[PDB]
Paper text:
The polycomb repressive complex 2 (PRC2) is a histone methyltransferase complex that is required for the maintenance of cell identity in all multicellular organisms. Here we provide functional and structural evidence that the vertebrate-specific PRC2 accessory subunit PALI1 emerged through a convergent evolution to mimic JARID2 at the molecular level. Mechanistically, PRC2 methylates PALI1 K1241, which then binds to the PRC2-regulatory subunit EED to allosterically activate PRC2. High-resolution crystal structures revealed that PALI1 mimics the regulatory interactions formed between JARID2 and EED.
PALI1 K1241 is methylated in mouse and human cell lines and is essential for PALI1-induced allosteric activation of PRC2. Indeed, the PALI1-K1241me3 peptide significantly stimulated the HMTase activity of PRC2 towards mononucleosome substrates. The affinity of EED for PALI1-K1241me3 (Kd = 7.49 ± 0.59 µM) is similar to the affinity of EED for the JARID2-K116me3 peptide (Kd = 8.07 ± 0.49 µM). The PALI1-K1241me3 peptide did not lead to the activation of the cage-mutant PRC2, in agreement with an EED-dependent allosteric activation of PRC2. We, therefore, solved the crystal structures of EED76–441 co-crystallised with a PALI1-K1241me3 or PALI1-K1219me3 peptide. The structures indicate that the two tri-methyl-lysine PALI1 peptides (left two panels) bind to EED in a conformation resembling that seen for the JARID2-K116me3 peptide (the third panel). Specifically, in all three cases the tri-methyl-lysine and its adjacent aromatic residue, in the +1 position, adopting the same conformation when binding to EED (marked in dashed shapes). Accordingly, a F1242A mutation in the PALI1-K1241me3 peptide prevents it from binding to EED and from stimulating PRC2. Altogether, these data and structures indicate that PALI1 and JARID2 interact with EED using their tri-methyl-lysine and its adjacent aromatic residue, despite no other sequence similarity and no common ancestor. Of note PALI1-K1241 and the adjacent F1242, but not PALI1-K1214 or PALI1-K1219, are fully conserved across different vertebrate species.
Author numbering:
A (entry chain B): 1239 to 1243
B (entry chain A): 81 to 107, 109 to 439
Write the structure that this text describes.
């Protein structure tokens, strides 16, 4: 997989 | 001796993906740029922690998302210039004084993930793209010098790249887990750069022909096991990271192998150290270094800063400092040091900006 948490 | 002296939040509440201090200055107050949403914004650092808002460039397309920026000199004026790019795949050259877009470059087939200017030639701009290619531009003559890519090029998005000290070679990295070396000091590439400077479209009928570079001079997938999203030369060594909570210091070949004797068939790498940290599992998280490469800073996904002191005899002896603030808890996407190393800025997924003073 992910670019964002 | 870093202390957090100020913070602020931009009005768009979108992630700030990039931050860069301008080192192409005269010294002149310390200025940095942030990129996020469809804008780039300049700030000036002042006494007592003050962060003075200057001016933004806002893209006409509300669906643009800027990811990265990079500073250079305007070779016609000696004033700085700022290049910005992101999801639209369009490079915009901004005059930071007026925030005017003075020219733009189309070509990449998708988003641009990083921009870098050549260390010795302020006109040579490298872009790396979701389209699996890198491109080298000459912004003085508005020419595409070379395209780096093909079947032996990256097989997925290129996420980061870096020129070495001399600007003789590039290391790139991306979602195919690989790091790839591209030498740009060949006779053909030096001749192509010369030709790019001789090109004036009002004086000729030809378009400017780019070099198509399909094969790297070295490639490895043996350093990381996931997306490789940040790479930097450290002399003849490489620092790179993936989303596995580690920055690896490594070199092509065996321990005694000189980087310039490395051949494209080289199968070996040497690992000289690894700097671990915590909670940095997401991709597109970039570290930065100071002007002298004495220090490296990286933020993680919960607002912690790691700063390594590289002024030690061997890479694995780096000394680590951590910087935390109880109000800074969003993911830190990038950091930047001022040219005199006195200020460290971190920018976050919640549009916040953190100033740390030495």
């Amino acid at each position: 997989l992910k670019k964002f948490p | 001796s870093f202390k957090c002296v100020n913070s602020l939040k931009e009005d768009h509440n979108q992630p700030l993906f990039g931050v860069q201090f301008n080192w192409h200055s005269k010294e002149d107050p310390l200025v940095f740029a942030t990129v996020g949403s469809n804008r780039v914004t300049l700030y000036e650092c002042h006494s007592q922690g003050e962060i003075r808002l200057l001016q933004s460039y806002v893209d006409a397309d509300a669906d643009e998302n800027f990811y990265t920026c990079a500073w250079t000199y305007d070779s016609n004026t000696s004033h700085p210039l700022l290049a910005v790019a992101g999801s639209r795949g369009i490079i915009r050259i901004i005059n930071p004084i007026t925030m005017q877009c003075i020219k733009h470059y189309v070509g990449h087939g998708n988003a641009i993930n990083e921009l870098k200017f050549h260390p010795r030639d302020p006109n040579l701009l490298l872009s790396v793209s979701k389209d699996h290619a890198l491109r080298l531009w000459n912004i003085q003559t508005d020419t595409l010098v070379a395209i780096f890519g093909g079947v032996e090029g990256h097989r997925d998005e290129v996420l980061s790249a870096d020129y070495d000290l001399l600007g003789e070679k590039i290391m790139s990295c991306g979602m195919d887990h690989s790091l790839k070396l591209w030498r740009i000091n060949s006779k053909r590439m030096m001749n192509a750069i010369k030709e790019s400077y001789d090109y004036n479209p009002n004086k000729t009928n030809r378009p400017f022909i780019s070099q198509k570079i399909h094969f790297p001079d070295f490639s490895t997938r043996d350093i990381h096991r996931n997306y490789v999203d940040c790479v930097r030369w450290l002399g003849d060594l490489i620092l790179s990271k993936s989303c596995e909570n580690a920055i690896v210091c490594w070199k092509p070949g065996k321990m005694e192998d000189d980087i310039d004797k490395i051949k494209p068939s080289e199968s070996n790498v040497t690992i000289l150290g690894r700097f671990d940290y915590s909670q940095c599992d997401i991709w597109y998280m970039r570290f930065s270094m100071d002007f002298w490469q004495k220090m490296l800073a990286l933020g993680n996904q919960v607002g912690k800063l790691y700063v390594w002191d590289l002024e030690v005899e061997d890479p694995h002896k780096a000394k680590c400092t951590t910087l935390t603030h109880h109000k800074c808890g969003a993911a830190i996407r990038q950091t930047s040091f001022s040219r005199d190393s006195s200020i460290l800025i971190a920018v976050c997924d919640d549009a916040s900006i953190w100033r740390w003073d030495r």
